[PDB]
């Protein structure tokens, strides 16, 4: 059920994200920033169990505040960069995720590394907001992002197969997927753009 319920939730959050992007282009800037802060707040709070309403709210908000990067890279490198990026994200998600659904060996150890990795990304990202890195650094940083988050997709579906995830845990667990998805998309899209 979990591999049928949680997945459905994830895809639903994808739909809501899409609506958030479509609406997001109409959303005036300077109001994007507090939505971003709200996004970080929801992330920190959820993983400090959040219900469906929380998840979908964050889905809409995240769907909105991703518009700047989307429109930027589309308007500098072509709409294809965005599309190819999206499809690529989809494929890596499907393949590596499926591997998560099949491979027996409990990938619970790497949880340490993975965490250390995301935190690392966070560090760089934080630094990046204050003192921006050159394109050369953005490329590397992006590649690392793609790797770490592909790993997080894999690991996540593996834990869906293994760990005693109660029914009620459905939303926040599906949220763990959505973040792993969105983050890959960005780091994979930005990769295509710099090229
Ligand atoms: Pt399944
Ligand atoms: Pt395996
Ligand atoms: Pt979990």
UniProtKB/Swiss-Prot annotation:
Changing residue 156 to E: Results in constantly open channel with reduced Ca(2+) affinity. It comes from Bacillus subtilis (strain 168). Monomer. Keywords: Calcium, Calcium transport, Cell membrane, Ion transport, Membrane, Transmembrane, Transmembrane helix, Transport. The chain crosses the membrane at residues 6-27, 35-48, 52-71, 81-102, 108-131, 137-160, 171-192. Calcium channel that probably plays a role in the regulation of calcium homeostasis. Uptakes calcium ions and mediates calcium flux in proteoliposomes in a pH-dependent manner. When expressed in E.coli in the presence of high extracellular calcium concentrations, shows calcium-leak activity, increasing intracellular calcium concentration. It can also mediate Ca(2+) flux from the endoplamic reticulum (ER) when expressed in permeabilized mammalian cells. Calcium transport activity is also detected in ER-like lipid vesicles. The calcium-release activity is mediated by two factors: pH and transmembrane ion gradient. Another study using nanodiscs suggests that Asp-156 is not a pH sensor regulating the pore dynamics; instead, it is only involved in the gating of calcium ions. GO terms for molecular function: calcium channel activity. The keyword Transmembrane helix applies. This is pH-sensitive calcium channel. The record marks 156 as: Important for activity. It comes from the Bacteria.
């Amino acid at each position: 059920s979990i591999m049928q319920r949680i997945l459905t939730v994830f895809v639903f959050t994808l739909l809501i994200a899409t609506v958030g992007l479509f609406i997001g282009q109409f959303v005036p800037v300077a109001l994007m920033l507090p939505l971003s802060i709200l996004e970080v707040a929801m992330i920190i709070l959820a993983f400090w169990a959040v219900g469906y309403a929380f998840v979908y709210t964050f889905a809409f908000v995240s769907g909105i505040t991703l518009f700047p990067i989307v429109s930027h890279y589309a308007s500098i490198a072509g709409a294809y960069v965005v599309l190819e990026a999206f499809g690529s994200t989809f494929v890596i998600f499907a393949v590596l995720g499926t591997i998560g659904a099949k491979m027996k060996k409990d990938l619970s150890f790497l949880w340490s590394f993975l965490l250390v990795a995301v935190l690392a990304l966070a560090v760089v990202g934080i630094f990046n907001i204050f003192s921006p890195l050159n394109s050369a650094a953005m490329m590397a940083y992006s590649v690392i992002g793609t790797i770490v988050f592909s790993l997080y997709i894999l690991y996540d579906l593996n834990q869906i197969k293994h760990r005693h995830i109660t029914e009620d845990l459905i939303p926040v667990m599906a949220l763990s997927l959505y973040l792993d998805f969105i983050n890959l998309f960005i780091n994979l899209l930005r990769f295509f753009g710099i090229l």
